[PDB]
């Protein structure tokens, strides 16, 4: 079992800049690769990270744009230089032995969103909606709804906390967020989520219901400030 | 003549910062055709015989790919073996690997092999049948079960009987001018008085390939493995070898002593006797 | 050369039925085969591999595949599906006879498996939910089977019911 | 456990006063792999000495050949100085013209 | 030509 740290995990940067992704491994291991994949799509191999020499690159990938360094067998970096919107994807560090039977492991990935205008980065507005009296009568149940709205780029993590403590059961967040203006080239996104319980659980006014959306945006090392944050609303 | 291809790898740990040393070299019979050195600038598998130079860039890139996998695996190995024997990082340790294959005069597979060592002593080796392993100690037994599970011996048998054999044939064909030659020994004898009543006779063999040679001294045609200094067969620098043997002789009795040279390039074995 | 075709982008199944993720391979020499799975926001996780010997290979959570030389296939199978098994599944081959020094596995495009959960007590009904501080619509309790108006897709929670918001 | 180098000092072609030749030092049968090898010319070493790539024999012991281009005479004494873990001090071996 | 598959001890 070879575990693979990648740091950073998520990062939003702009045309012309360069990100340097790291890949650490808990033990020393023979072969190291750098893969690149779009969400829900095929893996594309960038290069093979050779210990103590220049990485072997695949057709379509050049060292000038994609510097790779491998000082140890445990540690490697991929830099991606002079970034552009098309270079936005998940960057995967893969690892494994040179044996016939040996298994090829992958790592958590690194989400790179590359933008032209960094001023279009806005956080989400979280509004919670109460269950209808019609649903309580019909099913003896209560569905809460939470809408994140008006955020860019598309990646957020929605979760519910009941009585100040998180819950995974009875919860549902959409597979993917929806485009608010579908026609535009790069519009803002919207996301919904549901939480369901007993009727007597909701009718109890001493109970607490909160929706929590982690919005990953900019960092404090970038130039209100649409910084990485949490947005929350209660009922 | 029968023939062999052999690759020899040596990896050495260097405590702390920087990297270990890795040297790999390929042989066909007693002629080195390739090398990789980790301290070299190129970080590529390099030619060491003009007949391999004609191989394409796809050859050299593949061999550079594979030797780096050999290199990186050996570095991983050095830490593992240090872990198996419960050894500290302060000490310098040597790993050695040898594999290759032999062929008959028919150029069919004769045998294949793969030997591994730690600090100059057998660790694990594949048997002549190429299906099972011979572990030296308890740590090697741990590797034996791992290699058995990974079907390592199947993979080696495939290479050793197949790929190994085919490339040897090709190398023998492409390098026939050098590899299939047999330079026979140029022999002579020397005489030096050592005392009042003793003399030293030295039987010389020079400019021969391959290296395998036999130099016996004989008194009245009886073997003289006693009273006889034999230097090791040594390389000249030009792809040929050198040897000598010698005997201490009661002077006056030089004509009773014969030196017998056996070699592949000699139609009949030679016999020399000192002649003033 | 070496390659694998996964000829199906989407594969659907009801919870508890047989699921079949299909993979064929083409290889010059002899194959070692591999399966990998990816749940959202993670790397590929290892399932199972045919090295040699037994053609039927069993792994984890009742996953298996048979090495069929004649049809040149290594289809992933599992007798009864769970919902957590909804993921991206990748097949992969390694030409064990290659001598070219490209050690990486050669993968297929990827088949997305959707294990749709069972709905025992279907009762489809729209509801209108109000902001505690504005209104939204909700189409819930249903069975598995304009520029300014917004509509989300299906979603299942745990009693198990579907839902969708406007 | 550690083996000590055998050392032979000798010429490629037969020695001939005032003619081109290659001086050799063949070290062999040693372990571990690290080894210093100089070629001397009246006690003081020569700069441009090449060597073969490291390999080893059936018993795992290493061997190497060090060489340099030279022109011998009657006056010049040549030798091979070798240091190794096994040796407390370096071992010097003179070039015998008839050996 | 070298072996391809090298498996660590």
mmCIF file with all atom_site columns, N, CA and C in Angstrom, chain C residues 18-66:
data_model
loop_
_atom_site.group_PDB
_atom_site.id
_atom_site.type_symbol
_atom_site.label_atom_id
_atom_site.label_alt_id
_atom_site.label_comp_id
_atom_site.label_asym_id
_atom_site.label_entity_id
_atom_site.label_seq_id
_atom_site.pdbx_PDB_ins_code
_atom_site.Cartn_x
_atom_site.Cartn_y
_atom_site.Cartn_z
_atom_site.occupancy
_atom_site.B_iso_or_equiv
_atom_site.pdbx_formal_charge
_atom_site.auth_seq_id
_atom_site.auth_comp_id
_atom_site.auth_asym_id
_atom_site.auth_atom_id
_atom_site.pdbx_PDB_model_num
ATOM 1   N N  . UNK C 1 18 ? -27.513 -8.303  -11.439 1.00 0.00 ? 18 UNK C N  1
ATOM 2   C CA . UNK C 1 18 ? -26.162 -8.423  -12.008 1.00 0.00 ? 18 UNK C CA 1
ATOM 3   C C  . UNK C 1 18 ? -25.710 -7.164  -12.760 1.00 0.00 ? 18 UNK C C  1
ATOM 4   N N  . UNK C 1 19 ? -24.522 -6.667  -12.409 1.00 0.00 ? 19 UNK C N  1
ATOM 5   C CA . UNK C 1 19 ? -23.861 -5.574  -13.126 1.00 0.00 ? 19 UNK C CA 1
ATOM 6   C C  . UNK C 1 19 ? -22.699 -6.151  -13.939 1.00 0.00 ? 19 UNK C C  1
ATOM 7   N N  . UNK C 1 20 ? -22.528 -5.639  -15.156 1.00 0.00 ? 20 UNK C N  1
ATOM 8   C CA . UNK C 1 20 ? -21.495 -6.110  -16.076 1.00 0.00 ? 20 UNK C CA 1
ATOM 9   C C  . UNK C 1 20 ? -20.823 -4.915  -16.737 1.00 0.00 ? 20 UNK C C  1
ATOM 10  N N  . UNK C 1 21 ? -19.551 -4.699  -16.403 1.00 0.00 ? 21 UNK C N  1
ATOM 11  C CA . UNK C 1 21 ? -18.718 -3.683  -17.054 1.00 0.00 ? 21 UNK C CA 1
ATOM 12  C C  . UNK C 1 21 ? -17.804 -4.396  -18.051 1.00 0.00 ? 21 UNK C C  1
ATOM 13  N N  . UNK C 1 22 ? -18.002 -4.116  -19.340 1.00 0.00 ? 22 UNK C N  1
ATOM 14  C CA . UNK C 1 22 ? -17.329 -4.853  -20.410 1.00 0.00 ? 22 UNK C CA 1
ATOM 15  C C  . UNK C 1 22 ? -15.990 -4.235  -20.826 1.00 0.00 ? 22 UNK C C  1
ATOM 16  N N  . UNK C 1 23 ? -14.994 -5.104  -21.027 1.00 0.00 ? 23 UNK C N  1
ATOM 17  C CA . UNK C 1 23 ? -13.680 -4.727  -21.537 1.00 0.00 ? 23 UNK C CA 1
ATOM 18  C C  . UNK C 1 23 ? -13.124 -5.808  -22.454 1.00 0.00 ? 23 UNK C C  1
ATOM 19  N N  . UNK C 1 24 ? -12.666 -5.389  -23.635 1.00 0.00 ? 24 UNK C N  1
ATOM 20  C CA . UNK C 1 24 ? -11.842 -6.221  -24.516 1.00 0.00 ? 24 UNK C CA 1
ATOM 21  C C  . UNK C 1 24 ? -10.420 -5.667  -24.537 1.00 0.00 ? 24 UNK C C  1
ATOM 22  N N  . UNK C 1 25 ? -9.468  -6.500  -24.953 1.00 0.00 ? 25 UNK C N  1
ATOM 23  C CA . UNK C 1 25 ? -8.069  -6.098  -25.079 1.00 0.00 ? 25 UNK C CA 1
ATOM 24  C C  . UNK C 1 25 ? -7.499  -6.554  -26.420 1.00 0.00 ? 25 UNK C C  1
ATOM 25  N N  . UNK C 1 26 ? -6.565  -5.767  -26.957 1.00 0.00 ? 26 UNK C N  1
ATOM 26  C CA . UNK C 1 26 ? -5.706  -6.188  -28.070 1.00 0.00 ? 26 UNK C CA 1
ATOM 27  C C  . UNK C 1 26 ? -4.250  -6.055  -27.638 1.00 0.00 ? 26 UNK C C  1
ATOM 28  N N  . UNK C 1 27 ? -3.475  -7.119  -27.850 1.00 0.00 ? 27 UNK C N  1
ATOM 29  C CA . UNK C 1 27 ? -2.086  -7.202  -27.397 1.00 0.00 ? 27 UNK C CA 1
ATOM 30  C C  . UNK C 1 27 ? -1.264  -8.075  -28.359 1.00 0.00 ? 27 UNK C C  1
ATOM 31  N N  . UNK C 1 28 ? -0.049  -7.631  -28.681 1.00 0.00 ? 28 UNK C N  1
ATOM 32  C CA . UNK C 1 28 ? 0.868   -8.393  -29.541 1.00 0.00 ? 28 UNK C CA 1
ATOM 33  C C  . UNK C 1 28 ? 1.326   -9.697  -28.884 1.00 0.00 ? 28 UNK C C  1
ATOM 34  N N  . UNK C 1 29 ? 1.752   -9.603  -27.628 1.00 0.00 ? 29 UNK C N  1
ATOM 35  C CA . UNK C 1 29 ? 2.167   -10.760 -26.847 1.00 0.00 ? 29 UNK C CA 1
ATOM 36  C C  . UNK C 1 29 ? 1.040   -11.272 -25.973 1.00 0.00 ? 29 UNK C C  1
ATOM 37  N N  . UNK C 1 30 ? 1.347   -11.500 -24.691 1.00 0.00 ? 30 UNK C N  1
ATOM 38  C CA . UNK C 1 30 ? 0.416   -12.087 -23.725 1.00 0.00 ? 30 UNK C CA 1
ATOM 39  C C  . UNK C 1 30 ? 0.018   -11.041 -22.672 1.00 0.00 ? 30 UNK C C  1
ATOM 40  N N  . UNK C 1 31 ? -1.245  -11.080 -22.182 1.00 0.00 ? 31 UNK C N  1
ATOM 41  C CA . UNK C 1 31 ? -1.742  -10.011 -21.319 1.00 0.00 ? 31 UNK C CA 1
ATOM 42  C C  . UNK C 1 31 ? -1.737  -10.319 -19.810 1.00 0.00 ? 31 UNK C C  1
ATOM 43  N N  . UNK C 1 32 ? -1.405  -9.292  -19.030 1.00 0.00 ? 32 UNK C N  1
ATOM 44  C CA . UNK C 1 32 ? -1.786  -9.157  -17.629 1.00 0.00 ? 32 UNK C CA 1
ATOM 45  C C  . UNK C 1 32 ? -2.841  -8.054  -17.658 1.00 0.00 ? 32 UNK C C  1
ATOM 46  N N  . UNK C 1 33 ? -3.983  -8.275  -17.000 1.00 0.00 ? 33 UNK C N  1
ATOM 47  C CA . UNK C 1 33 ? -5.113  -7.335  -17.061 1.00 0.00 ? 33 UNK C CA 1
ATOM 48  C C  . UNK C 1 33 ? -5.402  -6.717  -15.692 1.00 0.00 ? 33 UNK C C  1
ATOM 49  N N  . UNK C 1 34 ? -6.079  -5.565  -15.689 1.00 0.00 ? 34 UNK C N  1
ATOM 50  C CA . UNK C 1 34 ? -6.265  -4.729  -14.488 1.00 0.00 ? 34 UNK C CA 1
ATOM 51  C C  . UNK C 1 34 ? -7.632  -4.035  -14.467 1.00 0.00 ? 34 UNK C C  1
ATOM 52  N N  . UNK C 1 35 ? -8.183  -3.844  -13.263 1.00 0.00 ? 35 UNK C N  1
ATOM 53  C CA . UNK C 1 35 ? -9.390  -3.022  -13.061 1.00 0.00 ? 35 UNK C CA 1
ATOM 54  C C  . UNK C 1 35 ? -9.140  -1.959  -11.993 1.00 0.00 ? 35 UNK C C  1
ATOM 55  N N  . UNK C 1 36 ? -9.658  -0.759  -12.254 1.00 0.00 ? 36 UNK C N  1
ATOM 56  C CA . UNK C 1 36 ? -9.524  0.392   -11.359 1.00 0.00 ? 36 UNK C CA 1
ATOM 57  C C  . UNK C 1 36 ? -10.870 1.097   -11.256 1.00 0.00 ? 36 UNK C C  1
ATOM 58  N N  . UNK C 1 37 ? -11.136 1.710   -10.103 1.00 0.00 ? 37 UNK C N  1
ATOM 59  C CA . UNK C 1 37 ? -12.391 2.444   -9.890  1.00 0.00 ? 37 UNK C CA 1
ATOM 60  C C  . UNK C 1 37 ? -12.115 3.844   -9.335  1.00 0.00 ? 37 UNK C C  1
ATOM 61  N N  . UNK C 1 38 ? -12.943 4.810   -9.741  1.00 0.00 ? 38 UNK C N  1
ATOM 62  C CA . UNK C 1 38 ? -12.835 6.192   -9.267  1.00 0.00 ? 38 UNK C CA 1
ATOM 63  C C  . UNK C 1 38 ? -14.184 6.733   -8.827  1.00 0.00 ? 38 UNK C C  1
ATOM 64  N N  . UNK C 1 39 ? -14.291 7.001   -7.528  1.00 0.00 ? 39 UNK C N  1
ATOM 65  C CA . UNK C 1 39 ? -15.414 7.741   -6.960  1.00 0.00 ? 39 UNK C CA 1
ATOM 66  C C  . UNK C 1 39 ? -15.023 9.222   -7.008  1.00 0.00 ? 39 UNK C C  1
ATOM 67  N N  . UNK C 1 40 ? -16.013 10.144  -6.987  1.00 0.00 ? 40 UNK C N  1
ATOM 68  C CA . UNK C 1 40 ? -15.728 11.580  -7.157  1.00 0.00 ? 40 UNK C CA 1
ATOM 69  C C  . UNK C 1 40 ? -14.610 12.152  -6.264  1.00 0.00 ? 40 UNK C C  1
ATOM 70  N N  . UNK C 1 41 ? -13.749 12.974  -6.877  1.00 0.00 ? 41 UNK C N  1
ATOM 71  C CA . UNK C 1 41 ? -12.697 13.757  -6.194  1.00 0.00 ? 41 UNK C CA 1
ATOM 72  C C  . UNK C 1 41 ? -11.616 12.899  -5.507  1.00 0.00 ? 41 UNK C C  1
ATOM 73  N N  . UNK C 1 42 ? -11.221 11.826  -6.191  1.00 0.00 ? 42 UNK C N  1
ATOM 74  C CA . UNK C 1 42 ? -10.198 10.888  -5.721  1.00 0.00 ? 42 UNK C CA 1
ATOM 75  C C  . UNK C 1 42 ? -9.425  10.344  -6.916  1.00 0.00 ? 42 UNK C C  1
ATOM 76  N N  . UNK C 1 43 ? -8.252  9.768   -6.650  1.00 0.00 ? 43 UNK C N  1
ATOM 77  C CA . UNK C 1 43 ? -7.493  9.039   -7.672  1.00 0.00 ? 43 UNK C CA 1
ATOM 78  C C  . UNK C 1 43 ? -8.155  7.714   -8.013  1.00 0.00 ? 43 UNK C C  1
ATOM 79  N N  . UNK C 1 44 ? -7.591  6.996   -8.984  1.00 0.00 ? 44 UNK C N  1
ATOM 80  C CA . UNK C 1 44 ? -8.068  5.655   -9.311  1.00 0.00 ? 44 UNK C CA 1
ATOM 81  C C  . UNK C 1 44 ? -7.659  4.691   -8.192  1.00 0.00 ? 44 UNK C C  1
ATOM 82  N N  . UNK C 1 45 ? -8.633  3.932   -7.677  1.00 0.00 ? 45 UNK C N  1
ATOM 83  C CA . UNK C 1 45 ? -8.388  2.868   -6.694  1.00 0.00 ? 45 UNK C CA 1
ATOM 84  C C  . UNK C 1 45 ? -8.319  1.509   -7.382  1.00 0.00 ? 45 UNK C C  1
ATOM 85  N N  . UNK C 1 46 ? -7.411  0.670   -6.893  1.00 0.00 ? 46 UNK C N  1
ATOM 86  C CA . UNK C 1 46 ? -7.182  -0.659  -7.447  1.00 0.00 ? 46 UNK C CA 1
ATOM 87  C C  . UNK C 1 46 ? -8.299  -1.628  -7.045  1.00 0.00 ? 46 UNK C C  1
ATOM 88  N N  . UNK C 1 47 ? -8.825  -2.387  -8.015  1.00 0.00 ? 47 UNK C N  1
ATOM 89  C CA . UNK C 1 47 ? -9.762  -3.500  -7.740  1.00 0.00 ? 47 UNK C CA 1
ATOM 90  C C  . UNK C 1 47 ? -9.064  -4.862  -7.828  1.00 0.00 ? 47 UNK C C  1
ATOM 91  N N  . UNK C 1 48 ? -8.793  -5.326  -9.048  1.00 0.00 ? 48 UNK C N  1
ATOM 92  C CA . UNK C 1 48 ? -8.205  -6.651  -9.236  1.00 0.00 ? 48 UNK C CA 1
ATOM 93  C C  . UNK C 1 48 ? -7.401  -6.759  -10.521 1.00 0.00 ? 48 UNK C C  1
ATOM 94  N N  . UNK C 1 49 ? -6.609  -7.824  -10.600 1.00 0.00 ? 49 UNK C N  1
ATOM 95  C CA . UNK C 1 49 ? -5.754  -8.086  -11.752 1.00 0.00 ? 49 UNK C CA 1
ATOM 96  C C  . UNK C 1 49 ? -5.614  -9.592  -12.025 1.00 0.00 ? 49 UNK C C  1
ATOM 97  N N  . UNK C 1 50 ? -5.652  -9.951  -13.307 1.00 0.00 ? 50 UNK C N  1
ATOM 98  C CA . UNK C 1 50 ? -5.250  -11.278 -13.770 1.00 0.00 ? 50 UNK C CA 1
ATOM 99  C C  . UNK C 1 50 ? -3.762  -11.209 -14.073 1.00 0.00 ? 50 UNK C C  1
ATOM 100 N N  . UNK C 1 51 ? -2.970  -11.900 -13.261 1.00 0.00 ? 51 UNK C N  1
ATOM 101 C CA . UNK C 1 51 ? -1.553  -12.088 -13.525 1.00 0.00 ? 51 UNK C CA 1
ATOM 102 C C  . UNK C 1 51 ? -1.420  -13.319 -14.430 1.00 0.00 ? 51 UNK C C  1
ATOM 103 N N  . UNK C 1 52 ? -1.589  -14.509 -13.854 1.00 0.00 ? 52 UNK C N  1
ATOM 104 C CA . UNK C 1 52 ? -1.569  -15.785 -14.583 1.00 0.00 ? 52 UNK C CA 1
ATOM 105 C C  . UNK C 1 52 ? -2.274  -16.833 -13.719 1.00 0.00 ? 52 UNK C C  1
ATOM 106 N N  . UNK C 1 53 ? -2.421  -18.045 -14.251 1.00 0.00 ? 53 UNK C N  1
ATOM 107 C CA . UNK C 1 53 ? -3.051  -19.147 -13.530 1.00 0.00 ? 53 UNK C CA 1
ATOM 108 C C  . UNK C 1 53 ? -4.553  -19.110 -13.724 1.00 0.00 ? 53 UNK C C  1
ATOM 109 N N  . UNK C 1 54 ? -5.292  -18.976 -12.624 1.00 0.00 ? 54 UNK C N  1
ATOM 110 C CA . UNK C 1 54 ? -6.756  -19.085 -12.647 1.00 0.00 ? 54 UNK C CA 1
ATOM 111 C C  . UNK C 1 54 ? -7.371  -17.940 -13.437 1.00 0.00 ? 54 UNK C C  1
ATOM 112 N N  . UNK C 1 55 ? -8.224  -18.287 -14.401 1.00 0.00 ? 55 UNK C N  1
ATOM 113 C CA . UNK C 1 55 ? -8.861  -17.307 -15.286 1.00 0.00 ? 55 UNK C CA 1
ATOM 114 C C  . UNK C 1 55 ? -9.911  -16.465 -14.551 1.00 0.00 ? 55 UNK C C  1
ATOM 115 N N  . UNK C 1 56 ? -10.675 -17.097 -13.659 1.00 0.00 ? 56 UNK C N  1
ATOM 116 C CA . UNK C 1 56 ? -11.601 -16.370 -12.795 1.00 0.00 ? 56 UNK C CA 1
ATOM 117 C C  . UNK C 1 56 ? -10.795 -15.776 -11.641 1.00 0.00 ? 56 UNK C C  1
ATOM 118 N N  . UNK C 1 57 ? -10.928 -14.461 -11.461 1.00 0.00 ? 57 UNK C N  1
ATOM 119 C CA . UNK C 1 57 ? -10.204 -13.707 -10.439 1.00 0.00 ? 57 UNK C CA 1
ATOM 120 C C  . UNK C 1 57 ? -11.241 -13.015 -9.558  1.00 0.00 ? 57 UNK C C  1
ATOM 121 N N  . UNK C 1 58 ? -11.189 -13.272 -8.251  1.00 0.00 ? 58 UNK C N  1
ATOM 122 C CA . UNK C 1 58 ? -12.098 -12.640 -7.287  1.00 0.00 ? 58 UNK C CA 1
ATOM 123 C C  . UNK C 1 58 ? -11.334 -11.615 -6.457  1.00 0.00 ? 58 UNK C C  1
ATOM 124 N N  . UNK C 1 59 ? -12.017 -10.529 -6.091  1.00 0.00 ? 59 UNK C N  1
ATOM 125 C CA . UNK C 1 59 ? -11.387 -9.384  -5.429  1.00 0.00 ? 59 UNK C CA 1
ATOM 126 C C  . UNK C 1 59 ? -12.083 -8.944  -4.154  1.00 0.00 ? 59 UNK C C  1
ATOM 127 N N  . UNK C 1 60 ? -12.776 -7.804  -4.225  1.00 0.00 ? 60 UNK C N  1
ATOM 128 C CA . UNK C 1 60 ? -13.387 -7.164  -3.056  1.00 0.00 ? 60 UNK C CA 1
ATOM 129 C C  . UNK C 1 60 ? -14.847 -6.823  -3.324  1.00 0.00 ? 60 UNK C C  1
ATOM 130 N N  . UNK C 1 61 ? -15.682 -6.973  -2.293  1.00 0.00 ? 61 UNK C N  1
ATOM 131 C CA . UNK C 1 61 ? -17.120 -6.658  -2.349  1.00 0.00 ? 61 UNK C CA 1
ATOM 132 C C  . UNK C 1 61 ? -17.870 -7.472  -3.413  1.00 0.00 ? 61 UNK C C  1
ATOM 133 N N  . UNK C 1 62 ? -17.418 -8.709  -3.635  1.00 0.00 ? 62 UNK C N  1
ATOM 134 C CA . UNK C 1 62 ? -17.974 -9.570  -4.671  1.00 0.00 ? 62 UNK C CA 1
ATOM 135 C C  . UNK C 1 62 ? -17.770 -9.015  -6.067  1.00 0.00 ? 62 UNK C C  1
ATOM 136 N N  . UNK C 1 63 ? -16.522 -8.675  -6.385  1.00 0.00 ? 63 UNK C N  1
ATOM 137 C CA . UNK C 1 63 ? -16.140 -8.289  -7.741  1.00 0.00 ? 63 UNK C CA 1
ATOM 138 C C  . UNK C 1 63 ? -15.292 -9.406  -8.343  1.00 0.00 ? 63 UNK C C  1
ATOM 139 N N  . UNK C 1 64 ? -15.498 -9.653  -9.637  1.00 0.00 ? 64 UNK C N  1
ATOM 140 C CA . UNK C 1 64 ? -14.754 -10.690 -10.349 1.00 0.00 ? 64 UNK C CA 1
ATOM 141 C C  . UNK C 1 64 ? -14.649 -10.449 -11.858 1.00 0.00 ? 64 UNK C C  1
ATOM 142 N N  . UNK C 1 65 ? -13.727 -11.171 -12.491 1.00 0.00 ? 65 UNK C N  1
ATOM 143 C CA . UNK C 1 65 ? -13.588 -11.150 -13.943 1.00 0.00 ? 65 UNK C CA 1
ATOM 144 C C  . UNK C 1 65 ? -12.924 -12.434 -14.444 1.00 0.00 ? 65 UNK C C  1
ATOM 145 N N  . UNK C 1 66 ? -13.369 -12.909 -15.610 1.00 0.00 ? 66 UNK C N  1
ATOM 146 C CA . UNK C 1 66 ? -12.834 -14.122 -16.231 1.00 0.00 ? 66 UNK C CA 1
ATOM 147 C C  . UNK C 1 66 ? -11.964 -13.755 -17.421 1.00 0.00 ? 66 UNK C C  1
#
